[PDB]
Amino acid sequence: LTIGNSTITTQEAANIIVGYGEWPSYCSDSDATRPDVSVNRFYTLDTKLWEKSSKGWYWKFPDVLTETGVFGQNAQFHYLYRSGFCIHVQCNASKFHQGALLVAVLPEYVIGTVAGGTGTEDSHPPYKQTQPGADGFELQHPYVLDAGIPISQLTVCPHQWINLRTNNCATIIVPYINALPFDSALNHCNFGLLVVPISPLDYDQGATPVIPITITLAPMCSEFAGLRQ
Amino acid sequence: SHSTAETTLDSFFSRAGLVGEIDLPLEGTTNPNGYANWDIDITGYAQMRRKVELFTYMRFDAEFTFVACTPTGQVVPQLLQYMFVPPGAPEPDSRESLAWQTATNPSVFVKLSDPPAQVSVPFMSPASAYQWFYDGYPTFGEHKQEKDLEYGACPNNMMGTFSVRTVGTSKSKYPLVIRIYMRMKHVRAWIPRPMRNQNYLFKANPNYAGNFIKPTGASRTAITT
Amino acid sequence: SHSTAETTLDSFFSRAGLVGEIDLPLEGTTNPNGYANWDIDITGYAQMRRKVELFTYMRFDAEFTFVACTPTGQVVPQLLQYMFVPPGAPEPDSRESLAWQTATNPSVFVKLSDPPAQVSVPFMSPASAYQWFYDGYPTFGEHKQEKDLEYGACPNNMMGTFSVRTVGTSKSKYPLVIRIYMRMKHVRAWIPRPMRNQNYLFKANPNYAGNFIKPTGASRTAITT
Amino acid sequence: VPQLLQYMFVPPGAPEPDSRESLAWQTATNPSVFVKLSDPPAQVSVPFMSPASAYQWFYDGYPTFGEHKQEKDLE
Amino acid sequence: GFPTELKPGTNQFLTTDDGVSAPILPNFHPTPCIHIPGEVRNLLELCQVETILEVNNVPTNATSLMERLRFPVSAQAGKGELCAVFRADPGRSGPWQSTLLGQLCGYYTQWSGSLEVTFMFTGSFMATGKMLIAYTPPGGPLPKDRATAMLGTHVIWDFGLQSSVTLVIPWISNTYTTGLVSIWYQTNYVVPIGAPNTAYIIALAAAQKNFTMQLCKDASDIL
Amino acid sequence: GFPTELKPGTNQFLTTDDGVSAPILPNFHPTPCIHIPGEVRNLLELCQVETILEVNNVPTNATSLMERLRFPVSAQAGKGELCAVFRADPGRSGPWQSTLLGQLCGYYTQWSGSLEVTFMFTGSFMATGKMLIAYTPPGGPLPKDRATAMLGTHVIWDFGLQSSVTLVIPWISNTYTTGLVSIWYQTNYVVPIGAPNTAYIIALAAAQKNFTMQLCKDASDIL
Amino acid sequence: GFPTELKPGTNQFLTTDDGVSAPILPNFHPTPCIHIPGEVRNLLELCQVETILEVNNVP
């Protein structure tokens, strides 16, 4: 893609999947400024440690981007925000590497904490358990994903499978999907990113024990809108 | 059958299933004031909850019937009227509360010989679809310095409640048992969710037990069939 | 809902609200003669009065229902007939008065198993619109030298009254409770008046108390929100 | 007598109720009608829902669809 | 004589039922409705009429109930702040319920819309100055200072032009509870020698086309 | 006023009856349903979605529940037999009930159809070999040996071609209860020096057009 | 709401009555009847078939 000073090469001979094949539409109800010069540069999320004992990572959107990045600082001005997400997952392995990673996006993924004892009596999640920042937290038991959701039923939603054999990278376009076009920004959780490997990483001794996995995102439809309050 | 019209969604889902029995004995502690209020809870009964948990967002019309009888199955000549209180109007607290005077509800005069009346209410929820668990902050401000008890609370999501009471100044001399049958007519699927495999422990929270189980372990070995 | 037809004036105003209970006990002092007369008063009940006081002149049709039951909510096999006396005919005073013989009113033979009958009366008022307080002099002469008691009086504005009595020579052996539900169907606005803010003290006069109050004083200071 | 009665049919798929509080009484597929004994008995109709195309009370053959003929074939 | 089984809900009595029965007088007919000049077919036209609002509900004693209707402006204040208009909630108690629109919305549950507050200037003839109106988006708190109000959406109001005020939305987002509009003293009220140093201002509110209700329910708190 | 004798079944109450009554709110109308991008009109399209299957349900303790999702392949086995896929019965307990299709069919009684089981190869890059799939007709028992499986219907699967697998019926007759599909080790998994000797394989099943149910009945075993 | 006096014979039960009621399964439809070679529409054709007669019923 060549727009301005940006010059990158990607593979256009992959399986590009779009959710239900429908771009977001604009609302026309009555119930009630797009800078893309220094904001359109591609952002690379910090690399995760893909390792044999790695259990997976989860991220709440756009909760983790409310303040952390440039998206955070220019969302600190506008009360509302809505844009498309460019999923960018790539596999970098040699002829001696094995594995199979499953990546999916689940709208309205509810988080569940731990609650032991005979009597059901739960408290409210604290600040760090609700948003741990960029540090993240490794799933203790991904077989039901630390939330009572077993892996066997994650396929019911639009999904795709990652086989590192033929692809070198995968790009997924998920449109701005929501039940209410006018909704809160810092309150409602639109969706979350779950990366659950199926085949654990396998390699003989001598190779690099960690594979650098890259996550990149770009605003497909930058629209802050809203009003100053 | 041979025709595929019999095997459609209307006949698949059209089935009046029991939702609960209203206990109004001659004497008791639960409702000694001669009336009771029953909130409409779909998650209360397991099987209908398991049916509705396959989906999240949907659109249907509601029709209610009040089947009342004695524990012996006989009828008595007593005057009864079924009146629904809107959510906007507060629930009646005393026998002489002004909530009994809602003019918006028409009244029908019948006798127990007449089979139970049929009442229908449309989808009057303020939102476009049902949502029993609210993810997010109901407060629409920056207040996050105090104890946020609103997490999971929704003081706006009540659909109302029913008010069945003994009409008349004199106390009823007969014990009664009330049964209610529900079924969904117009079903549409908007946002699919995985159908629950692990049993729920509480109805107002998605919390689970610390000791998970396996759906089935009949297969001792993969070799044997 | 999505259609605007559900949110129209017909559904906004169509609501059968309680107007009063007719007390006809087995023994008592109010009506020991076995019958009673209830004048139709819209100003008697506060909420319907507060509803109708938004306007002055209007045009609607009236439909009446008589729901009768025992204080225990049971029915008894007793013969009852609902008969309305026109204003022209005088109200019956004795049990054997000739006012019971009005031929203009048809009769229907039913039993308590049949739900209560429905009776409708059109707008038969001599004037074109309702007027509960009469400003002016009913006398159409120059007489202003005596004590004019007619100020506010209107011997022509009665709309009639209902006559519910126990049919038969033998006295009824059961206590009864009667309830009546009212709602307006055809509403039109002709002369608007301000909607009342200060509570009335009497129903037949617009008089008020000498100690006026404030609708609300929650806001302690204008600065605080 | 003034007693409340309801006629409910259990499908073959659903098991027959064994106890007074069995969950088989909770079949949602069957609508309910509220009447009194003054009303004459209700009329209920069921179509031909048998898995086969026609009735067969005596079954000639082996229900087992295998080669097992070495044991006591009670089927 | 015709076959029919007793269907459920024949003798059922409904609170909201609308039925027709034979008139009590099949021979006496009501008089026809004659034409009268005063004529209204929908009360909604009366519903969106302009209404006055009583701001100074600070006093409560009977000895000061006379000046509730109007509020004064003082020249002693310099670069300060007169008053913050309360949140546009016709349901919540306060000055809103005293209004006809508030009494209207008191029988309903939900209400969503964008509100405009118009001010007409009633200073002295030789009085001059600039007064500034600014709106705050919902969610955000009250602006701390006049500079804080200025750094957001701002509208210039001149004393020679009365009705140029218009509703401009701050921003739209894609997702206390609601925001409020506030007024701040840009320039203190100044008059020369021989002119009075105080005046009175009148506040009025109206209803827009986008103001609607979906559900009706009978709920009166008073009395 | 019209002649009619009381026909049987007027006041009869039916469990499956579908009737309409007057709405409780004849004046409050529900809001219209607005357009949302996510849209499904029939849940059947979701019903024939692909589903993963959990084969290794051999363990039962909580200390080994993590590796249930995937199963390994070992090179130690030579010309042997990995596993026999269980009979395609969505109703019978086991791996079938864990599937979404099995949970779907758990509310029904009968099901007849022909099933295909697809496998995608996930060995090492330099790994080579031939793996063989064979189906057994119903009634006939499990094949005794790899030769016994070969003498029936047989399908050649190459590791370089992924989706060529298709459903071929063994034979049709004119008349245990149902047959099963089994996999046998034609060639042991071989890798050269420096490559790992183990790998993982994934099994997935889907629904065909000929999959239908005729009768609906409310029957839940859990809970 | 419509005038009708109770006519005789409404709730009457008849031995030979032929009526129709709502099906118990409004959503489960019976399978269509497939074509089979053996087909008879009237049993009368079977009724006038030839029959043997047993004369010697003396023993």
PDB file of N, CA, C and O in Angstrom, chain A residues 30-34 78-82 176 178 180-188 190 223-229, chain E residues 112-115 135-141 151-153 168-180 210-211:
ATOM      1  N   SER A  30     -32.621  11.179  15.929  1.00  0.00           N
ATOM      2  CA  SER A  30     -32.435  12.493  16.527  1.00  0.00           C
ATOM      3  C   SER A  30     -32.034  12.435  17.993  1.00  0.00           C
ATOM      4  O   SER A  30     -31.876  13.489  18.617  1.00  0.00           O
ATOM      5  N   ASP A  31     -31.871  11.239  18.554  1.00  0.00           N
ATOM      6  CA  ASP A  31     -31.480  11.081  19.953  1.00  0.00           C
ATOM      7  C   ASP A  31     -30.049  11.573  20.137  1.00  0.00           C
ATOM      8  O   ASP A  31     -29.090  10.926  19.713  1.00  0.00           O
ATOM      9  N   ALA A  32     -29.902  12.729  20.777  1.00  0.00           N
ATOM     10  CA  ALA A  32     -28.590  13.314  21.019  1.00  0.00           C
ATOM     11  C   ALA A  32     -28.602  14.170  22.281  1.00  0.00           C
ATOM     12  O   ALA A  32     -29.630  14.740  22.647  1.00  0.00           O
ATOM     13  N   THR A  33     -13.381  17.100  12.049  1.00  0.00           N
ATOM     14  CA  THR A  33     -12.807  16.725  13.336  1.00  0.00           C
ATOM     15  C   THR A  33     -12.298  15.289  13.310  1.00  0.00           C
ATOM     16  O   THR A  33     -12.452  14.548  14.281  1.00  0.00           O
ATOM     17  N   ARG A  34     -11.689  14.901  12.188  1.00  0.00           N
ATOM     18  CA  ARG A  34     -11.140  13.559  11.995  1.00  0.00           C
ATOM     19  C   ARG A  34      -9.692  13.687  11.545  1.00  0.00           C
ATOM     20  O   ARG A  34      -9.386  13.538  10.351  1.00  0.00           O
ATOM     21  N   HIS A  78     -12.680  13.537  22.668  1.00  0.00           N
ATOM     22  CA  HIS A  78     -14.021  13.237  22.184  1.00  0.00           C
ATOM     23  C   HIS A  78     -14.668  12.203  23.095  1.00  0.00           C
ATOM     24  O   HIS A  78     -14.040  11.199  23.446  1.00  0.00           O
ATOM     25  N   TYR A  79     -15.921  12.448  23.467  1.00  0.00           N
ATOM     26  CA  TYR A  79     -16.655  11.574  24.373  1.00  0.00           C
ATOM     27  C   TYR A  79     -17.018  10.234  23.744  1.00  0.00           C
ATOM     28  O   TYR A  79     -17.223   9.259  24.474  1.00  0.00           O
ATOM     29  N   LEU A  80     -17.092  10.159  22.419  1.00  0.00           N
ATOM     30  CA  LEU A  80     -17.461   8.941  21.717  1.00  0.00           C
ATOM     31  C   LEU A  80     -16.430   8.632  20.639  1.00  0.00           C
ATOM     32  O   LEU A  80     -15.707   9.518  20.176  1.00  0.00           O
ATOM     33  N   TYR A  81     -16.365   7.360  20.252  1.00  0.00           N
ATOM     34  CA  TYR A  81     -15.432   6.921  19.226  1.00  0.00           C
ATOM     35  C   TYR A  81     -15.973   5.665  18.561  1.00  0.00           C
ATOM     36  O   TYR A  81     -16.631   4.844  19.208  1.00  0.00           O
ATOM     37  N   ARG A  82     -15.690   5.523  17.268  1.00  0.00           N
ATOM     38  CA  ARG A  82     -16.083   4.338  16.517  1.00  0.00           C
ATOM     39  C   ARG A  82     -15.196   4.232  15.286  1.00  0.00           C
ATOM     40  O   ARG A  82     -14.979   5.229  14.589  1.00  0.00           O
ATOM     41  N   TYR A 176     -17.364  -2.330  12.154  1.00  0.00           N
ATOM     42  CA  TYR A 176     -17.918  -1.820  13.401  1.00  0.00           C
ATOM     43  C   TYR A 176     -19.317  -2.384  13.606  1.00  0.00           C
ATOM     44  O   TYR A 176     -20.299  -1.832  13.097  1.00  0.00           O
ATOM     45  N   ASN A 178     -22.414  -3.486  16.064  1.00  0.00           N
ATOM     46  CA  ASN A 178     -23.019  -3.168  17.351  1.00  0.00           C
ATOM     47  C   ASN A 178     -24.528  -3.118  17.174  1.00  0.00           C
ATOM     48  O   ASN A 178     -25.034  -2.810  16.092  1.00  0.00           O
ATOM     49  N   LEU A 180     -26.625  -1.046  18.904  1.00  0.00           N
ATOM     50  CA  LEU A 180     -27.076   0.333  18.930  1.00  0.00           C
ATOM     51  C   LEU A 180     -26.018   1.243  18.319  1.00  0.00           C
ATOM     52  O   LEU A 180     -24.901   1.332  18.842  1.00  0.00           O
ATOM     53  N   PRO A 181     -26.330   1.918  17.209  1.00  0.00           N
ATOM     54  CA  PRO A 181     -25.335   2.815  16.597  1.00  0.00           C
ATOM     55  C   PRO A 181     -24.890   3.932  17.522  1.00  0.00           C
ATOM     56  O   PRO A 181     -23.737   4.374  17.440  1.00  0.00           O
ATOM     57  N   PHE A 182     -25.771   4.402  18.402  1.00  0.00           N
ATOM     58  CA  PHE A 182     -25.432   5.412  19.394  1.00  0.00           C
ATOM     59  C   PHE A 182     -25.298   4.728  20.744  1.00  0.00           C
ATOM     60  O   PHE A 182     -26.299   4.304  21.329  1.00  0.00           O
ATOM     61  N   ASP A 183     -24.067   4.621  21.233  1.00  0.00           N
ATOM     62  CA  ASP A 183     -23.772   3.908  22.467  1.00  0.00           C
ATOM     63  C   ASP A 183     -22.617   4.596  23.184  1.00  0.00           C
ATOM     64  O   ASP A 183     -21.895   5.415  22.607  1.00  0.00           O
ATOM     65  N   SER A 184     -22.447   4.254  24.458  1.00  0.00           N
ATOM     66  CA  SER A 184     -21.364   4.817  25.244  1.00  0.00           C
ATOM     67  C   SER A 184     -20.024   4.235  24.795  1.00  0.00           C
ATOM     68  O   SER A 184     -19.938   3.124  24.264  1.00  0.00           O
ATOM     69  N   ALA A 185     -18.964   5.007  25.020  1.00  0.00           N
ATOM     70  CA  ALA A 185     -17.615   4.629  24.617  1.00  0.00           C
ATOM     71  C   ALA A 185     -16.799   4.009  25.738  1.00  0.00           C
ATOM     72  O   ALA A 185     -16.198   2.951  25.543  1.00  0.00           O
ATOM     73  N   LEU A 186     -16.761   4.640  26.909  1.00  0.00           N
ATOM     74  CA  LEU A 186     -15.950   4.170  28.023  1.00  0.00           C
ATOM     75  C   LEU A 186     -16.691   3.207  28.942  1.00  0.00           C
ATOM     76  O   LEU A 186     -16.126   2.791  29.959  1.00  0.00           O
ATOM     77  N   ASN A 187     -17.932   2.847  28.620  1.00  0.00           N
ATOM     78  CA  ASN A 187     -18.722   1.965  29.471  1.00  0.00           C
ATOM     79  C   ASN A 187     -18.950   0.595  28.855  1.00  0.00           C
ATOM     80  O   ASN A 187     -18.604  -0.421  29.470  1.00  0.00           O
ATOM     81  N   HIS A 188     -19.511   0.532  27.650  1.00  0.00           N
ATOM     82  CA  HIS A 188     -19.914  -0.725  27.033  1.00  0.00           C
ATOM     83  C   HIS A 188     -18.715  -1.382  26.360  1.00  0.00           C
ATOM     84  O   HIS A 188     -17.948  -0.715  25.655  1.00  0.00           O
ATOM     85  N   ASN A 190     -17.444  -3.536  23.555  1.00  0.00           N
ATOM     86  CA  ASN A 190     -17.884  -4.001  22.243  1.00  0.00           C
ATOM     87  C   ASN A 190     -17.503  -5.455  21.996  1.00  0.00           C
ATOM     88  O   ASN A 190     -18.358  -6.264  21.621  1.00  0.00           O
ATOM     89  N   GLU A 223     -13.745   8.179  12.977  1.00  0.00           N
ATOM     90  CA  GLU A 223     -14.901   9.043  13.208  1.00  0.00           C
ATOM     91  C   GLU A 223     -15.036   9.248  14.713  1.00  0.00           C
ATOM     92  O   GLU A 223     -15.619   8.410  15.409  1.00  0.00           O
ATOM     93  N   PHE A 224     -14.495  10.359  15.209  1.00  0.00           N
ATOM     94  CA  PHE A 224     -14.640  10.687  16.623  1.00  0.00           C
ATOM     95  C   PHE A 224     -16.064  11.133  16.930  1.00  0.00           C
ATOM     96  O   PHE A 224     -16.751  10.523  17.758  1.00  0.00           O
ATOM     97  N   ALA A 225     -16.518  12.191  16.267  1.00  0.00           N
ATOM     98  CA  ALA A 225     -17.886  12.711  16.395  1.00  0.00           C
ATOM     99  C   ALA A 225     -18.140  13.062  17.863  1.00  0.00           C
ATOM    100  O   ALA A 225     -17.207  13.391  18.607  1.00  0.00           O
ATOM    101  N   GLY A 226     -19.399  13.001  18.292  1.00  0.00           N
ATOM    102  CA  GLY A 226     -19.718  13.317  19.666  1.00  0.00           C
ATOM    103  C   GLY A 226     -19.704  14.817  19.919  1.00  0.00           C
ATOM    104  O   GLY A 226     -19.605  15.640  19.005  1.00  0.00           O
ATOM    105  N   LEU A 227     -19.806  15.166  21.198  1.00  0.00           N
ATOM    106  CA  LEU A 227     -19.806  16.552  21.639  1.00  0.00           C
ATOM    107  C   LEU A 227     -18.907  16.692  22.859  1.00  0.00           C
ATOM    108  O   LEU A 227     -18.677  15.738  23.607  1.00  0.00           O
ATOM    109  N   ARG A 228     -18.396  17.906  23.057  1.00  0.00           N
ATOM    110  CA  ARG A 228     -17.475  18.180  24.151  1.00  0.00           C
ATOM    111  C   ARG A 228     -18.249  18.286  25.460  1.00  0.00           C
ATOM    112  O   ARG A 228     -19.063  19.200  25.634  1.00  0.00           O
ATOM    113  N   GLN A 229     -17.996  17.357  26.376  1.00  0.00           N
ATOM    114  CA  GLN A 229     -18.612  17.385  27.698  1.00  0.00           C
ATOM    115  C   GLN A 229     -17.609  16.962  28.766  1.00  0.00           C
ATOM    116  O   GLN A 229     -16.456  16.654  28.461  1.00  0.00           O
TER     117      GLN A 229
ATOM    118  N   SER E 112     -35.719  11.791  25.711  1.00  0.00           N
ATOM    119  CA  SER E 112     -34.395  12.047  25.156  1.00  0.00           C
ATOM    120  C   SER E 112     -34.509  13.141  24.107  1.00  0.00           C
ATOM    121  O   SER E 112     -35.423  13.110  23.278  1.00  0.00           O
ATOM    122  N   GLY E 113     -33.592  14.099  24.149  1.00  0.00           N
ATOM    123  CA  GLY E 113     -33.619  15.179  23.183  1.00  0.00           C
ATOM    124  C   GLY E 113     -32.575  16.223  23.508  1.00  0.00           C
ATOM    125  O   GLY E 113     -31.941  16.192  24.565  1.00  0.00           O
ATOM    126  N   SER E 114     -32.405  17.152  22.574  1.00  0.00           N
ATOM    127  CA  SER E 114     -31.486  18.269  22.722  1.00  0.00           C
ATOM    128  C   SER E 114     -32.270  19.556  22.954  1.00  0.00           C
ATOM    129  O   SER E 114     -33.196  19.882  22.208  1.00  0.00           O
ATOM    130  N   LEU E 115     -31.885  20.285  24.000  1.00  0.00           N
ATOM    131  CA  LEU E 115     -32.628  21.439  24.487  1.00  0.00           C
ATOM    132  C   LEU E 115     -31.864  22.729  24.220  1.00  0.00           C
ATOM    133  O   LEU E 115     -30.629  22.754  24.259  1.00  0.00           O
ATOM    134  N   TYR E 135     -22.363  25.541  26.153  1.00  0.00           N
ATOM    135  CA  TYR E 135     -22.985  24.281  26.536  1.00  0.00           C
ATOM    136  C   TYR E 135     -21.917  23.226  26.790  1.00  0.00           C
ATOM    137  O   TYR E 135     -20.868  23.223  26.135  1.00  0.00           O
ATOM    138  N   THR E 136     -22.188  22.333  27.742  1.00  0.00           N
ATOM    139  CA  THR E 136     -21.265  21.269  28.111  1.00  0.00           C
ATOM    140  C   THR E 136     -21.850  19.921  27.717  1.00  0.00           C
ATOM    141  O   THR E 136     -23.025  19.656  28.008  1.00  0.00           O
ATOM    142  N   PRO E 137     -21.084  19.053  27.065  1.00  0.00           N
ATOM    143  CA  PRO E 137     -21.608  17.742  26.664  1.00  0.00           C
ATOM    144  C   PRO E 137     -21.904  16.878  27.875  1.00  0.00           C
ATOM    145  O   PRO E 137     -21.307  17.069  28.947  1.00  0.00           O
ATOM    146  N   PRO E 138     -22.823  15.923  27.750  1.00  0.00           N
ATOM    147  CA  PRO E 138     -23.136  15.043  28.881  1.00  0.00           C
ATOM    148  C   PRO E 138     -21.944  14.186  29.277  1.00  0.00           C
ATOM    149  O   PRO E 138     -21.061  13.881  28.473  1.00  0.00           O
ATOM    150  N   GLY E 139     -21.929  13.797  30.550  1.00  0.00           N
ATOM    151  CA  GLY E 139     -20.826  13.032  31.096  1.00  0.00           C
ATOM    152  C   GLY E 139     -19.776  13.909  31.744  1.00  0.00           C
ATOM    153  O   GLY E 139     -19.384  13.677  32.891  1.00  0.00           O
ATOM    154  N   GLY E 140     -19.313  14.922  31.015  1.00  0.00           N
ATOM    155  CA  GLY E 140     -18.336  15.848  31.531  1.00  0.00           C
ATOM    156  C   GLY E 140     -18.874  16.664  32.688  1.00  0.00           C
ATOM    157  O   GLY E 140     -20.067  16.974  32.759  1.00  0.00           O
ATOM    158  N   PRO E 141     -18.001  17.025  33.622  1.00  0.00           N
ATOM    159  CA  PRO E 141     -18.433  17.788  34.794  1.00  0.00           C
ATOM    160  C   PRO E 141     -18.596  19.268  34.471  1.00  0.00           C
ATOM    161  O   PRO E 141     -18.355  19.728  33.354  1.00  0.00           O
ATOM    162  N   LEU E 151     -12.879  27.204  26.604  1.00  0.00           N
ATOM    163  CA  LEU E 151     -12.111  26.241  25.821  1.00  0.00           C
ATOM    164  C   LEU E 151     -12.980  25.164  25.181  1.00  0.00           C
ATOM    165  O   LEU E 151     -12.483  24.430  24.319  1.00  0.00           O
ATOM    166  N   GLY E 152     -14.246  25.050  25.571  1.00  0.00           N
ATOM    167  CA  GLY E 152     -15.161  24.151  24.899  1.00  0.00           C
ATOM    168  C   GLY E 152     -15.990  24.875  23.858  1.00  0.00           C
ATOM    169  O   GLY E 152     -15.576  25.923  23.354  1.00  0.00           O
ATOM    170  N   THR E 153     -17.157  24.328  23.524  1.00  0.00           N
ATOM    171  CA  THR E 153     -18.047  24.985  22.575  1.00  0.00           C
ATOM    172  C   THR E 153     -18.530  26.310  23.144  1.00  0.00           C
ATOM    173  O   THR E 153     -18.897  26.395  24.319  1.00  0.00           O
ATOM    174  N   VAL E 168     -26.214  24.296  18.890  1.00  0.00           N
ATOM    175  CA  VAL E 168     -25.077  23.650  18.245  1.00  0.00           C
ATOM    176  C   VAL E 168     -24.616  22.524  19.162  1.00  0.00           C
ATOM    177  O   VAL E 168     -24.396  22.738  20.360  1.00  0.00           O
ATOM    178  N   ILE E 169     -24.472  21.324  18.607  1.00  0.00           N
ATOM    179  CA  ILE E 169     -24.075  20.154  19.389  1.00  0.00           C
ATOM    180  C   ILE E 169     -22.559  20.137  19.547  1.00  0.00           C
ATOM    181  O   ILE E 169     -21.828  20.406  18.581  1.00  0.00           O
ATOM    182  N   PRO E 170     -22.042  19.858  20.748  1.00  0.00           N
ATOM    183  CA  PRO E 170     -20.585  19.851  20.946  1.00  0.00           C
ATOM    184  C   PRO E 170     -19.870  18.776  20.142  1.00  0.00           C
ATOM    185  O   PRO E 170     -18.974  19.081  19.348  1.00  0.00           O
ATOM    186  N   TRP E 171     -20.261  17.518  20.337  1.00  0.00           N
ATOM    187  CA  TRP E 171     -19.614  16.402  19.669  1.00  0.00           C
ATOM    188  C   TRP E 171     -20.479  15.162  19.838  1.00  0.00           C
ATOM    189  O   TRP E 171     -21.289  15.075  20.763  1.00  0.00           O
ATOM    190  N   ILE E 172     -20.295  14.200  18.936  1.00  0.00           N
ATOM    191  CA  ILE E 172     -21.024  12.938  18.963  1.00  0.00           C
ATOM    192  C   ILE E 172     -20.019  11.809  19.138  1.00  0.00           C
ATOM    193  O   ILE E 172     -19.003  11.762  18.433  1.00  0.00           O
ATOM    194  N   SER E 173     -20.298  10.907  20.076  1.00  0.00           N
ATOM    195  CA  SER E 173     -19.442   9.763  20.353  1.00  0.00           C
ATOM    196  C   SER E 173     -20.141   8.492  19.883  1.00  0.00           C
ATOM    197  O   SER E 173     -21.334   8.493  19.567  1.00  0.00           O
ATOM    198  N   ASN E 174     -19.386   7.397  19.844  1.00  0.00           N
ATOM    199  CA  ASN E 174     -19.882   6.108  19.364  1.00  0.00           C
ATOM    200  C   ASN E 174     -19.678   5.075  20.468  1.00  0.00           C
ATOM    201  O   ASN E 174     -18.612   4.456  20.560  1.00  0.00           O
ATOM    202  N   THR E 175     -20.696   4.891  21.301  1.00  0.00           N
ATOM    203  CA  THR E 175     -20.627   3.932  22.397  1.00  0.00           C
ATOM    204  C   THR E 175     -21.558   2.750  22.152  1.00  0.00           C
ATOM    205  O   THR E 175     -21.877   2.426  21.008  1.00  0.00           O
ATOM    206  N   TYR E 176     -21.796  13.705  35.300  1.00  0.00           N
ATOM    207  CA  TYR E 176     -22.842  12.844  35.836  1.00  0.00           C
ATOM    208  C   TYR E 176     -23.515  12.201  34.612  1.00  0.00           C
ATOM    209  O   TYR E 176     -22.912  12.166  33.539  1.00  0.00           O
ATOM    210  N   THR E 177     -24.737  11.686  34.758  1.00  0.00           N
ATOM    211  CA  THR E 177     -25.389  11.006  33.641  1.00  0.00           C
ATOM    212  C   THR E 177     -25.658  11.950  32.475  1.00  0.00           C
ATOM    213  O   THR E 177     -25.463  11.571  31.314  1.00  0.00           O
ATOM    214  N   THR E 178     -26.099  13.176  32.754  1.00  0.00           N
ATOM    215  CA  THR E 178     -26.437  14.129  31.708  1.00  0.00           C
ATOM    216  C   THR E 178     -25.741  15.456  31.975  1.00  0.00           C
ATOM    217  O   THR E 178     -25.463  15.812  33.123  1.00  0.00           O
ATOM    218  N   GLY E 179     -25.465  16.185  30.895  1.00  0.00           N
ATOM    219  CA  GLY E 179     -24.796  17.466  31.014  1.00  0.00           C
ATOM    220  C   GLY E 179     -25.768  18.615  31.208  1.00  0.00           C
ATOM    221  O   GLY E 179     -26.978  18.480  31.034  1.00  0.00           O
ATOM    222  N   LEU E 180     -25.215  19.768  31.575  1.00  0.00           N
ATOM    223  CA  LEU E 180     -25.987  20.978  31.816  1.00  0.00           C
ATOM    224  C   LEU E 180     -25.349  22.151  31.085  1.00  0.00           C
ATOM    225  O   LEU E 180     -24.162  22.114  30.746  1.00  0.00           O
ATOM    226  N   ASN E 210     -38.163  17.133  17.802  1.00  0.00           N
ATOM    227  CA  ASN E 210     -37.599  15.839  18.163  1.00  0.00           C
ATOM    228  C   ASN E 210     -37.991  15.387  19.565  1.00  0.00           C
ATOM    229  O   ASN E 210     -37.416  14.414  20.066  1.00  0.00           O
ATOM    230  N   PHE E 211     -38.939  16.061  20.210  1.00  0.00           N
ATOM    231  CA  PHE E 211     -39.352  15.693  21.555  1.00  0.00           C
ATOM    232  C   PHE E 211     -40.563  14.776  21.464  1.00  0.00           C
ATOM    233  O   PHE E 211     -41.626  15.191  20.991  1.00  0.00           O
TER     234      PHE E 211
END
